[PDB]
């Protein structure tokens, strides 16, 4: 059985770039593409759903710096990312995207507008820092390293490198940090992630950064969590039912963990549920910008182009919103910014659930409603 994580505040990892262990490229670099008969002159559905243009009357993210911890970005005029370091390739600086992912995450956050298409990011004036922290294209040069030690898995290595990248992003002055990584593991194969909990506490409570993270997508090691047992009112979020830990998703409420919804507003079937999910955002059939800063809405797959889907894109919308909120209310702490966002989130029935948390974000409301400032800091368990 699983209980919420306890943070060892003294275990902050050193602020160093580079992979948990030496790596090499094994895959050819991927490149995003375009579905047949796409008309990019129209607004992407997510822009209409979230009323991005209406929200932009109230803020644009000017003066705010967002760190994109993802697969790197190939920068362009419309996605003017800056190097935040590379935690996959020792030779890199974060300005190379071999996965066709990080670039689109960054464009959703702060992609600039164009007279020739209807795409614009949520916060088109932010400064963007790219930290490449994952990639399917790289592997460790050395082999495992004792295949029954759960701390020598790649999942565990990614957790340790994520920790350094959070410290690094905060020390670079990111006020909003978007994390696409969702490391999944079982109760019985527990990873030592004290370095990560410590990094997060440092970035949020010492450096004042908002951290927004993907809920995670179902797949190989991420198998869906079952729903809470309603007959146990003392465990309303169903910690006792959890089978899969998702990290850093489970550091709620220090971080804001974001699930995905589809075009009709439904919670996405690939979105990882858990007692830690705090909000949701568009995460299916998305449009973003490619390596040249032009619109893309697909990545190639085995039997054709595949639509842009994923909770990392959902988190990106929320990171964009946090940048808007940060510009408009510059004195708010991270907890207070997150509070504005969750207080204006909504879903039928209401309350908080394991799929959309407080619900789908509402940018205009986050920016304009009268919402009493919450406490400056979120409570958490410490050793």
């Amino acid at each position: 059985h699983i209980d919420p994580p306890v943070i060892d505040a003294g275990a902050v990892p050193p602020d160093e770039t580079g992979p948990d262990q030496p790596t090499e490229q094994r895959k050819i670099c991927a490149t995003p593409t375009v579905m047949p008969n796409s008309n990019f002159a129209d607004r992407p559905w997510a822009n209409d759903y979230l009323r991005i243009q209406e929200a932009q009357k109230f803020a644009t993210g000017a003066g705010v710096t967002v760190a994109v911890i993802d697969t790197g970005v190939n920068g362009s005029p419309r996605v003017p990312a800056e190097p935040g370091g590379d935690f996959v390739d020792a030779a890199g600086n974060g300005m190379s995207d071999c996965d066709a992912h990080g670039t689109m995450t960054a464009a959703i956050i702060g992609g600039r507008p164009s007279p020739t298409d209807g795409f614009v990011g949520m916060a088109p004036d932010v400064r963007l820092l790219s930290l490449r922290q994952t990639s399917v294209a790289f592997q460790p040069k050395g082999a495992r390293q004792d295949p029954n030690d759960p701390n020598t898995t790649q999942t565990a290595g990614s957790i340790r490198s994520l920790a350094r990248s959070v410290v690094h992003a905060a020390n670079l002055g990111a006020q909003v940090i978007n994390i696409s990584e969702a490391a999944c593991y079982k109760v019985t194969r527990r990873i030592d992630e004290t370095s990560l909990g410590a990094a997060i506490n440092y970035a949020v409570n010492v450096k004042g950064a908002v951290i927004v993270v993907a809920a995670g997508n179902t797949g190989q090691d991420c198998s869906q969590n079952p729903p809470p047992d309603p007959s146990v009112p003392s465990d309303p979020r169903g910690w006792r039912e959890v089978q899969t830990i998702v990290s850093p998703a489970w550091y709620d409420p220090l971080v804001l963990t974001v699930g995905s919804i589809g075009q009709n507003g439904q919670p996405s079937n690939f979105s990882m549920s858990g007692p830690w999910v705090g909000a949701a955002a568009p995460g299916e059939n998305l449009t973003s910008l490619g390596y040249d800063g032009q619109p893309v809405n697909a990545t190639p797959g085995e039997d054709g182009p595949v639509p842009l889907n994923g909770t990392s894109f959902s988190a990106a919308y929320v990171s964009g919103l946090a940048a808007l909120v940060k510009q408009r209310f510059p004195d708010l702490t991270p907890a207070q910014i997150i509070n504005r966002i969750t207080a204006t989130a909504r879903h039928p029935g209401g309350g908080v659930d394991n799929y959309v948390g407080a619900g789908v974000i509402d940018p205009v409301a986050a920016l304009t409603w009268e919402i009493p400032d919450g406490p400056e800091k979120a409570p958490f368990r410490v050793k």
Side-chain angles (χ1 to χ4, degrees), residues 12 28 51 59 62 90 119 137 140 211 238 350:
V12 180
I28 293 174
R51 315 179 69 200
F119 180 87
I211 305 191

Side-chain angles (χ1 to χ4, degrees), residues 78-188 190-219 221-302 304-348:
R78 289 182 73 185
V79 196
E82 296 171 9
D86 203 316
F87 294 80
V88 169
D89 182 13
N93 66 352
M95 289 307 297
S96 175
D97 180 3
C98 207
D99 292 54
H101 190 280
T103 304
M104 291 96 89
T105 302
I108 280 164
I109 296 165
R112 262 117 265 230
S114 163
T116 53
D117 63 66
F119 180 87
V120 66
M122 168 81 67
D125 288 325
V126 301
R127 182 169 158 247
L128 296 154
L129 311 183
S130 176
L131 296 79
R132 167 160 68 176
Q133 186 271 327
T134 58
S135 172
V136 302
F138 285 78
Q139 292 293 318
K141 297 172 68 97
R144 258 182 110 185
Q145 79 168 6
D146 191 4
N148 292 330
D149 184 7
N151 279 295
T152 64
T153 62
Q154 285 204 69
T155 294
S158 169
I159 278 174
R160 297 194 291 277
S161 71
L162 174 59
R164 292 185 282 106
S165 79
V166 162
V167 173
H168 192 73
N171 289 346
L172 287 175
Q175 293 135 309
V176 179
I177 298 171
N178 190 83
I179 301 179
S180 293
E181 167 76 311
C184 299
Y185 57 98
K186 258 68 224 171
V187 202
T188 29
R190 264 167 175 277
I191 294 161
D192 175 28
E193 44 169 291
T194 62
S195 57
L196 178 54
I200 284 164
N201 179 60
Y202 170 78
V204 177
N205 291 315
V206 178
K207 290 305 236 119
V210 174
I211 305 191
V212 181
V213 314
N217 309 325
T218 53
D221 277 326
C222 309
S223 50
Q224 193 50 271
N225 282 316
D229 191 344
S231 81
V232 188
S234 56
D235 183 20
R237 301 299 300 279
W239 280 91
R240 185 152 147 278
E241 277 64 62
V242 177
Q243 279 167 6
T244 302
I245 288 147
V246 183
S247 184
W250 74 335
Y251 290 102
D252 172 71
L254 271 175
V255 309
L256 175 59
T257 297
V258 180
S260 166
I261 52 142
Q263 194 168 340
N264 294 332
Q266 283 150 301
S268 302
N269 54 33
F270 55 75
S271 195
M272 282 293 302
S273 73
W276 44 71
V277 179
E284 303 181 20
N285 296 312
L286 302 175
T287 296
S288 193
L289 301 184
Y291 298 166
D292 56 355
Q294 290 303 286
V296 297
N297 59 3
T299 64
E302 188 98 47
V306 164
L308 310 182
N309 290 5
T311 51
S312 61
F313 298 137
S314 303
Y317 280 111
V318 179
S319 288
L321 177 54
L324 297 189
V325 179
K326 175 71 182 176
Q327 177 190 4
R328 186 171 173 81
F329 305 94
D331 296 330
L332 293 192
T333 66
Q336 292 170 330
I337 290 170
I338 293 174
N339 181 59
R340 290 199 62 92
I341 292 175
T342 59
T344 51
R346 61 221 252 253
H347 59 117

Side-chain angles (χ1 to χ4, degrees), residues 351-371:
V352 299
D353 71 25
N354 284 14
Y355 315 97
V356 296
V360 185
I361 56 160
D362 183 340
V364 170
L367 291 165
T368 58
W369 285 21
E370 292 281 340
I371 297 152

Side-chain angles (χ1 to χ4, degrees), residues 33-42 297:
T33 187
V34 165
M35 303 283 294
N37 202 23
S38 301
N39 185 11
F40 293 118
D42 309 311
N297 59 3

